[PDB]
Design an enzyme around this catalytic site. Structure first.
Site, PDB file in Angstrom:
ATOM      1  N   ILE A   1      -7.991   0.941   9.607  1.00 14.20           N
ATOM      2  CA  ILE A   1      -9.109   1.873   9.580  1.00 14.20           C
ATOM      3  C   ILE A   1     -10.320   1.213   8.922  1.00 14.20           C
ATOM      4  CG2 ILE A   1      -7.832   4.040   9.727  1.00 14.20           C
ATOM      5  CD1 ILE A   1      -7.894   4.179   6.674  1.00 14.20           C
TER       6      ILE A   1
ATOM      7  N   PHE B   1       2.190   9.820   3.139  1.00 12.53           N
ATOM      8  CA  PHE B   1       2.527   9.738   4.553  1.00 12.53           C
ATOM      9  C   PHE B   1       2.927   8.343   5.012  1.00 12.53           C
ATOM     10  CE2 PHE B   1      -2.024   8.987   4.304  1.00 12.53           C
ATOM     11  CZ  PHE B   1      -2.218   7.918   5.156  1.00 12.53           C
ATOM     12  N   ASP B   2       2.673   7.299   4.221  1.00 11.92           N
ATOM     13  CA  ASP B   2       3.013   5.936   4.609  1.00 11.92           C
ATOM     14  C   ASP B   2       3.011   5.065   3.361  1.00 11.92           C
ATOM     15  OD1 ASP B   2       3.780   3.952   6.436  1.00 11.92           O
ATOM     16  OD2 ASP B   2       1.718   3.378   6.901  1.00 11.92           O
TER      17      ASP B   2
ATOM     18  N   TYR C   1       0.828  -1.192   0.000  1.00  9.54           N
ATOM     19  CA  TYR C   1       0.000   0.000   0.000  1.00  9.54           C
ATOM     20  C   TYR C   1       0.865   1.244   0.000  1.00  9.54           C
ATOM     21  CZ  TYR C   1       0.873   0.820   4.997  1.00  9.54           C
ATOM     22  OH  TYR C   1       1.468   1.042   6.216  1.00  9.54           O
TER      23      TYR C   1
ATOM     24  N   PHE D   1      -5.597   5.714  -0.845  1.00 10.22           N
ATOM     25  CA  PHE D   1      -4.701   4.574  -0.718  1.00 10.22           C
ATOM     26  C   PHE D   1      -4.590   3.853  -2.051  1.00 10.22           C
ATOM     27  CE2 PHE D   1      -5.733   5.299   3.713  1.00 10.22           C
ATOM     28  CZ  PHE D   1      -4.556   4.987   4.376  1.00 10.22           C
TER      29      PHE D   1
ATOM     30  N   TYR E   1      -9.105   8.591  10.129  1.00  8.17           N
ATOM     31  CA  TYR E   1      -8.671   9.113  11.422  1.00  8.17           C
ATOM     32  C   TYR E   1      -9.542  10.249  11.971  1.00  8.17           C
ATOM     33  CZ  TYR E   1      -4.751   6.188  10.316  1.00  8.17           C
ATOM     34  OH  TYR E   1      -3.961   5.109   9.992  1.00  8.17           O
TER      35      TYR E   1
END
EC number: 5.2.1.8
Length: 108
Positions: free
Chosen positions: A57, A37-38, A27, A100, A83
């Protein structure tokens, strides 16, 4: 809104995750502006979670359940499935819609 699933490449179109299976995914997580961010791809290690155990999530639980093995999809996730109002200090801002890029590699 909820989670929107947009296909990038098709999977087998037959094998969908069921509750309690372990999903193995690569991902990349981005804010709506496009800021990453990730990403499991930058770590070169796929990420595993068990569907239905709320280890991820809500948008992932509902979005990945709609994907077939081998599919790569773009998930757009509203903050209530994400979030929320709180966000994640220093990583995800309040009320953030997240995008994502997710590839479902296999189920265990």
């Amino acid at each position: 809104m909820g989670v929107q699933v947009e296909t990038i490449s098709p999977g087998d179109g037959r094998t969908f995750p069921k509750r309690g299976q372990t999903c193995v995914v690569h991902y990349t997580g981005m804010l709506e502006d496009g800021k990453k961010f990730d990403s499991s791809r930058d770590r070169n290690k796929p990420f595993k979670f068990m569907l239905g155990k709320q280890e991820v999530i809500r948008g992932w639980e509902e979005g990945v359940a709609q994907m077939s093995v081998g599919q790569r999809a773009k998930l757009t996730i509203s903050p209530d499935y994400a979030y929320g109002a709180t966000g994640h200090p220093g990583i995800i801002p309040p009320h953030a819609t997240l995008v994502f890029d997710v590839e479902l590699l296999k189920l265990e």
